[PDB]
Ligand binder design. Sequence first.
Ligand SMILES: O=C(O)Cc1c[nH]c2ccccc12
Ligand SMILES: O=C(O)Cc1c[nH]c2ccccc12
Ligand SMILES: O=C(O)Cc1c[nH]c2ccccc12
Ligand SMILES: O=C(O)Cc1c[nH]c2ccccc12
Lengths: 101, 101
Amino acid sequence: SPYSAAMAEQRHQEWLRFVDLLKNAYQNDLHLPLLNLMLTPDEREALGTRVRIVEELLRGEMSQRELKNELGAGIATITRGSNSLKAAPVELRQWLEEVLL
Amino acid sequence: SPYSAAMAEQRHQEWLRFVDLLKNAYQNDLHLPLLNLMLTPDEREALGTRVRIVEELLRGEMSQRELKNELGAGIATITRGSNSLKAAPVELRQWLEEVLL
Ligand SMILES: O=C(O)Cc1c[nH]c2ccccc12
Ligand SMILES: O=C(O)Cc1c[nH]c2ccccc12
Ligand SMILES: O=C(O)Cc1c[nH]c2ccccc12
Ligand SMILES: O=C(O)Cc1c[nH]c2ccccc12
């Protein structure tokens, strides 16, 4: 039932509605309270850390435990971050290199 | 310790860095791939469902228990979202009542 095409369609519509809602929140300077409402504290903390992981993966200068050192992320978390960056369209990846480095 | 002054300060700045990175992604129409990179599929699904919860709570036409029957979220999740809505600043609440309802 969660795995039906109907639920897949509903999930994507709901995601796109959120995406569109946050787009307009940025336009109206309400993005910060909106992200406080819609995300828990540990999710905000995780998003801030994930930015630093992507930056350091793209810079390519640190190993496992130093990334585990200054960020406290396990080897599994960094691997999944690495997987996700490998899948990213390179328009996104090249822009991230420009702004994060 | 995660519960120190320096770690709190860094947690705040890392979160605001993500918020600004995403603001720039919207401006460049890279928000969808950035959000596919930075969030897991289940976090994206949760955010879609949380928009629906906030909508129905503000609407006030759906009982908190029949919210679970429609959306799948446990009463504990409905309650936490209601807690976050009660803590939201009024200007956000007023804006959501325009755009969600
Ligand atoms: O340290 C704090 O002020 C509380 C807190 C917990 N998780 C957070 C994520 C982002 C910003 C603040 C917090
Ligand atoms: O957070 C996870 O466990 C997976 C993950 C998704 N995007 C990431 C970006 C950087 C590091 C980890 C992840
Ligand atoms: O509350 C504060 O700002 C003081 C403080 C909390 N944890 C600390 C760890 C090391 C040095 C100072 C603090
Ligand atoms: O998802 C959670 O458990 C917490 C939560 C944060 N914002 C929410 C909005 C609606 C429903 C739940 C939440």
